[PDB]
Amino acid sequence: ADPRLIESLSQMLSMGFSDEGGWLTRLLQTKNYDIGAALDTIQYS
Amino acid sequence: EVQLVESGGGLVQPGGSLRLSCVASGFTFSNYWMYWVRQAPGKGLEWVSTINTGSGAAYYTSSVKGRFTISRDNAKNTLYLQMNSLKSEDTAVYYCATDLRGAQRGQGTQVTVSSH
C-alpha cells in the first residue's frame, strides 16, 4: 500500500467521510492524493 | 450551545491583507476539524480552508492556496484566517463552520475588495 494514499485517506476519514466501496480511495487516486483537490470535487456534488 | 462569532472583515484594495478571527465555544474546539466558508455575491456557500486543531493539518481550496493561511489558538478558542493579495473574486461573507458545507456557522463577516 502506498503510504501517501494511507496518509491522505486517514486524514479524510477523520473528517467524517467513509470509504464505502472504495470511493474515497478512488477519488484521492484521481486527485494525486491532494485533499484540497478532493474536497473541491466533493463540494461539487 | 455551539457558538461561532466571526470578526475582522472590511473593505480593502486589490492586493490588500486582512485577518479574520472566530471565537468558538460550546464544544471541543481544541481537537476539531474547523472550516472557513464564504458566500460570494449571488453564489452559494463554498468552503475556503480547513484545519484540524489537534494536529495542525491545514488544507485550502484551489483558488486560495498560497494566498490564505489558516491557524488556531487553542488557548483562546479562536480560529484565524490570514488573507493576502486579495482579489475581487474573494469578495464574500466569510463564516467559520464545524462542517464543510457551512451548516453550523456564525453570523459571518463581510470582506469587500474594491480599488481605491
Residue numbers in the entry:
A (entry chain E): 391 to 435
B (entry chain A): 1 to 116
Pull verbatim passages from the article behind this deposition.
In this highly conserved pathway, intracellular constituents that are modified with polyubiquitin, or other signaling molecules such as lipids or sugars, are recognized by autophagy cargo receptors such as p62 (encoded by SQSTM1), NDP52, NBR1, OPTN and more. These autophagy cargo receptors oligomerize, sequestering the cargo, and further recruit ATG8 family proteins (MAP1LC3A, MAP1LC3B, MAP1LC3C, GABARAP, GABARAPL1, and GABARAPL2) by binding via LC3-interacting regions (LIRs). The ability of p62 to form oligomers and undergo phase separation upon interaction with polyubiquitin chains is essential for lysosomal delivery of cargo because these processes increase avidity which stabilizes the interactions with autophagosome membranes. We further report a single-domain antibody against p62 and its use as a heterobifunctional degrader to clear mitochondria.
